[PDB]
């Protein structure tokens, strides 16, 4: 409703860096809000795409941002009569970024890895890797939980069980208020998908450079399965956290699996021990139900609610014809120990191929009425197909069925305006929570400032 669509702020990165593929707000130890932006195709030292991360100070004028520097050199360690190798070329550093406390977590889902023992090899595979930085102190650390040293022949004997070679850890990410990093790895367990969790503090204390393979005892990975319903499900395509069991000491995980059960798609709510509490099934196959998940209390009853995006849902229309538009599902948490029922509200896109629901950002309470609100992205929507971000306001019964404000892309065609979103943070310190929108196709990020209600 009360985002300012007239005077925007534009931050920008190098041409073709996909600056804005991922973003988040970052408060330093003093509370000053900056913007962290990942550019997964930034050039490295060898003039090869390795990705990059930028830390943007808040200025109403926007502009260029300084880099958040990470190591981009390939590593090699000859240890244990073996040879460990990391390959950062086209790793996509900055394909997901997330902030917690004064720490930034930027991930390279496609960082490759291999191990050589004489003539055998583990196979050069994309295990993924996340880089962690404390910008004020200059501390750095890495976390790559899927790196292994098992040779290729072994996996064949055991029928590829516990195969974490293609995890792409860091594909999606989130951090619990307690400070436990949670990485989605959609390729883990031969493309079933796994999650990896580990306290940020322990990642730093257990990391040393050049070790490449180290233990993080306090970590916790999800589990392989022999159930074909999970096969090629990309469990961990998206991740989020919330409170869903009534126990405030436990933190619950929400996982997207948009190709679960033969592309039916699914979303699962688990406890911290990866035990399944509820499961939401996709409504339509290949709709990619689970592409994005969002957790926020929208009806002001204190119980977090669940939103799931299915950006390729095909809506029924006259004459038995369908139309890919995308759909968003709202699930309201019921009082006490009970299962999440049918969706309380269905939001469906309008523009063909618009991919409504590609991203879903909790906004907090935008208009300050006591009900939290959300923003939904249709990165190829609007009458021009340039992209649209739609705001829906919370109410006592859930959300409003019609949007309160629509943001049209200020970029040219192909910018993927809205492909990444992030809200619920007050960046100019005017008492109102603001919205940052990524448009990696245009290598820019747009900041919308919330203003008092008119």
């Amino acid at each position, epitope marked *: 409703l009360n985002l300012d669509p007239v005077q925007l702020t534009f931050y920008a990165g190098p041409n073709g860096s996909q600056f804005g593929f991922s973003l988040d707000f970052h408060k330093d130890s003093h509370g000053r809000v900056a913007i962290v932006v990942g550019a997964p195709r930034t050039l490295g030292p060898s003039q090869e795409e390795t990705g990059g991360v930028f830390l943007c100070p808040w200025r109403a004028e926007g502009g260029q941002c300084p880099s958040l520097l990470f190591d981009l050199r390939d590593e090699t360690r000859n240890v*244990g009569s073996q040879t460990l190798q990391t390959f950062k070329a086209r790793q996509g550093l900055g394909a997901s970024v997330v902030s917690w406390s004064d720490v930034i977590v930027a991930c390279a889902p496609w960082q490759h890895w291999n191990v050589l023992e004489k003539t055998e090899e583990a196979e050069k595979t994309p295990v993924g890797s996340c880089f962690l930085a404390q910008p004020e102190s200059g501390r750095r650390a890495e976390y790559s939980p899927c790196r292994g040293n098992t040779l290729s022949r072994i996996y064949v004997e055991n029928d590829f069980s516990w195969d974490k070679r293609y995890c792409e850890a860091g594909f999606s990410s989130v951090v619990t208020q307690a400070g436990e990093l949670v990485l989605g790895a959609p390729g883990g367990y031969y493309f079933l998908g796994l999650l990896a969790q580990a306290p940020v503090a322990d990642i730093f204390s257990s990391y040393r450079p050049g070790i490449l393979l180290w233990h993080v005892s306090s970590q916790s990975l999800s589990f392989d399965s022999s159930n074909p319903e999970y096969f090629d499900g990309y469990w961990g395509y998206s991740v989020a956290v919330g409170e869903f069991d009534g126990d405030l000491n436990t933190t619950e995980y929400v996982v997207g699996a948009p190709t679960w059960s033969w592309t039916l798609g699914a979303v699962e709510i688990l406890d911290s021990y990866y035990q399944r509490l509820h499961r939401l099934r996709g409504e339509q196959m290949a709709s990619y139900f689970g592409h994005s998940v969002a957790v926020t209390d929208v009806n002001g009853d204190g119980r977090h609610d669940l939103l799931v995006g299915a950006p390729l849902y095909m809506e029924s229309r006259a004459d038995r014809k369908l139309a890919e538009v995308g759909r968003v599902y709202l699930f309201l948490q019921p009082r006490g120990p009970h299962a999440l029922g049918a969706p309380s509200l269905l939001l469906t896109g309008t523009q063909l191929y618009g991919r409504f629901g590609s991203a879903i950002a909790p906004l907090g309470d935008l208009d300050r009425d006591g009900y939290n609100d959300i923003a939904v992205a249709a990165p190829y929507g609007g009458p021009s197909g340039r992209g649209q971000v739609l705001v829906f306001l919370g109410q006592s019964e859930g959300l409003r069925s019609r949007p309160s404000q629509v943001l049209d892309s200020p970029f040219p065609t192909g910018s993927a305006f809205g492909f990444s979103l992030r809200g619920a943070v007050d960046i100019d310190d005017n008492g109102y929570p603001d919205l940052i929108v990524g448009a990696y196709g245009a290598n820019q990020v747009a900041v919308y400032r919330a203003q008092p209600v008119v």
Partner: antibody
Amino acid sequence: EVQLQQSGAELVKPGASVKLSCTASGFNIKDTYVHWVKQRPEQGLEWIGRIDPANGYTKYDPKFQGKATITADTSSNTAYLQLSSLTSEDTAVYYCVRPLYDYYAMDYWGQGTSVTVSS
Amino acid sequence: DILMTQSPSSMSVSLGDTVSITCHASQGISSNIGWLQQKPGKSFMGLIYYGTNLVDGVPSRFSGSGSGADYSLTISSLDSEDFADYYCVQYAQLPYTFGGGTKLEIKR
């Protein structure tokens, strides 16, 4: 905390066999590699072998192939070292080792199991 | 196998001294070396891993250094507890091999 509690001292005859134990305390034995190291006053320290208790795969120094047999039961969270056809030269102190962070290191050590072979 | 020549075999020193133990390998091991301590009539405790990194709980007066095939363990200001045995172990290749050992003795 991480502690490796081994079996009591053993007192055996030549030609017999013995099975030492290394029980994990404060962690899961399945987490890391588990090595076995032999110590003598003259010959010093010698590396016997290792095992990955998650899968049971083992590596050995060619010097101990035949005498040393390393196993692991994740149920009782314990790693074992079996020695066969014992000899006066097999009289030594035996330690189980695991790394702290580095997959390949040798950082945490059990107290050591004393072995004496004699008729 | 990789031969670990550790030197010296022993040294007579006093409290507060700054001493250095060395370890020479038959070939390069690229900092894949650990250092160990065995207080008299007791077990082992880890000091260094990957050449320079302190094991959690070890005082900062310890410090490892070196590269290629020549490494060093240094103790700044000896404490009464530091009089013990010290060994170097390489894990660059299987089988792991240990150095001869170094005993720190009180000087008088």
